[PDB]
Amino acid sequence: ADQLTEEQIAEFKEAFSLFDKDGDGTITTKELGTVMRSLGQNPTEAELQDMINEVDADGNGTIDFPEFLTMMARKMKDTDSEEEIREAFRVFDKDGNGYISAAELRHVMTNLGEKLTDEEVDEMIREADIDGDGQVNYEEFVQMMTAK
Ligand SMILES: COc1cc(CNC(=O)CCCC/C=C/C(C)C)ccc1O
Ligand SMILES: [Ca+2]
Ligand SMILES: [Ca+2]
Ligand SMILES: [Ca+2]
Ligand SMILES: [Ca+2]
């Protein structure tokens, strides 16, 4: 009956130590690839794999913690985006009473570009999602992103 639970939040908290679990403190593609299990199959990493090494190839396909927070901070917007996404609810979600499915989401992602994989969302939304029915909405948008 309860959709929001503390357990769900703990997942993100635990994942924090999961990345460094490999060693004392290090962020590498191997660590990220591990998360693939919780997501079953998230190409998002496959395509990015090259992107990570490219920008990370400055010294090694690994990123230090001091830079990890900065990178995630800029890449991921704080929870304050909730208000910003609020305006996007009407435009992003025309139906309003309805939610965007994975199939419809793909069409939107296509218009954006093709830098990332096309399957990332199709499979990521399939496993990582408890419902498995794939659905995106304003309420979920806030939980989707959380830099802090
Ligand atoms: C540094 O590159 C990395 C960035 C992230 C951050 N992860 C994300 O941004 C997940 C992608 C969000 C998918 C959005 C789908 C919408 C259209 C519904 C994780 C690991 C990394 O290696
Ligand atoms: Ca490490
Ligand atoms: Ca680095
Ligand atoms: Ca929709
Ligand atoms: Ca869902």
Curated annotation (Swiss-Prot):
GO terms for molecular function: adenylate cyclase activator activity; calcium channel inhibitor activity; calcium channel regulator activity; calcium ion binding; calcium-dependent protein binding; protein kinase binding; protein phosphatase activator activity; protein serine/threonine kinase activator activity. Ca(2+) 3 binds at residues 93, 95, 97, 99, 104. The modification N-acetylalanine is found at residue 1. There is a cross-link at residue 21 (Glycyl lysine isopeptide (Lys-Gly) (interchain with G-Cter in ubiquitin)). Changing residue 141 to L: In LQT14; reduction in calcium affinity; not changed protein abundance; not changed structure; significantly decreased thermal stability in presence of calcium; no effect on RYR2 interaction; significantly reduced ryanodine-sensitive calcium-release channel activity; impaired negative regulation of high voltage-gated calcium channel activity; impaired regulation of cardiac muscle cell action potential and. InterPro entries: CALM/Myosin/TropC-like, EF-hand-dom_pair, EF_Hand_1_Ca_BS, EF_hand_dom. The modification Phosphotyrosine is found at residues 99, 138. Ca(2+) 1 binds at residues 20, 22, 24, 26, 31. The modification N6,N6,N6-trimethyllysine is found at residue 115. It holds the Pfam family EF-hand_7. Keywords: Acetylation, Calcium, Cell projection, Cilium, Cytoplasm, Cytoskeleton, Disease variant, Flagellum, Host-virus interaction, Isopeptide bond, Long QT syndrome, Metal-binding, Methylation, Phosphoprotein, Repeat, Ubl conjugation. GO terms for cellular component: calcium channel complex; calyx of Held; catalytic complex; centrosome; cytoplasm; cytosol; extracellular region; myelin sheath. Ubiquitination results in a strongly decreased activity. It is found in: Cytoplasm, Cytoskeleton, Spindle; Cytoplasm, Cytoskeleton, Spindle pole; Cytoplasm, Cytoskeleton, Microtubule organizing center, Centrosome; Cell projection, Cilium, Flagellum. (Microbial infection) Inactivated by S.flexneri OspC1 and OspC3 proteins, which specifically bind the apo-form of calmodulin, thereby preventing calcium-binding and activity. Ca(2+) 4 binds at residues 129, 131, 133, 135, 140. One of its GO terms (biological process) is response to calcium ion. Residues 7-42, 43-78, 80-115, 116-148 form the EF-hand domain. The modification Phosphothreonine is found at residues 44, 110. Belongs to the calmodulin family. Calmodulin acts as part of a calcium signal transduction pathway by mediating the control of a large number of enzymes, ion channels, aquaporins and other proteins through calcium-binding. Calcium-binding is required for the activation of calmodulin. Among the enzymes to be stimulated by the calmodulin-calcium complex are a number of protein kinases, such as myosin light-chain kinases and calmodulin-dependent protein kinase type II (CaMK2), and phosphatases. The N-terminal and C-terminal lobes of CALM bind to the C-terminus of KCNQ1 in a clamp-like conformation. Binding of CALM C-terminus to KCNQ1 is calcium-independent but is essential for assembly of the structure. Binding of CALM N-terminus to KCNQ1 is calcium-dependent and regulates electrophysiological activity of the channel. The C-lobe interacts with KCNN4 channels in a calcium-independent manner, whereas the N-lobe interacts with the S4-S5 linker of KCNN4 in a calcium-dependent manner playing a role as calcium sensor and gating the channel. PANTHER family: CALMODULIN LIKE 3 (PTHR23048:SF0), MYOSIN LIGHT CHAIN 1, 3 (PTHR23048). This is Calmodulin-1. The lineage of its organism: Eukaryota, Metazoa, Chordata, Craniata, Vertebrata.
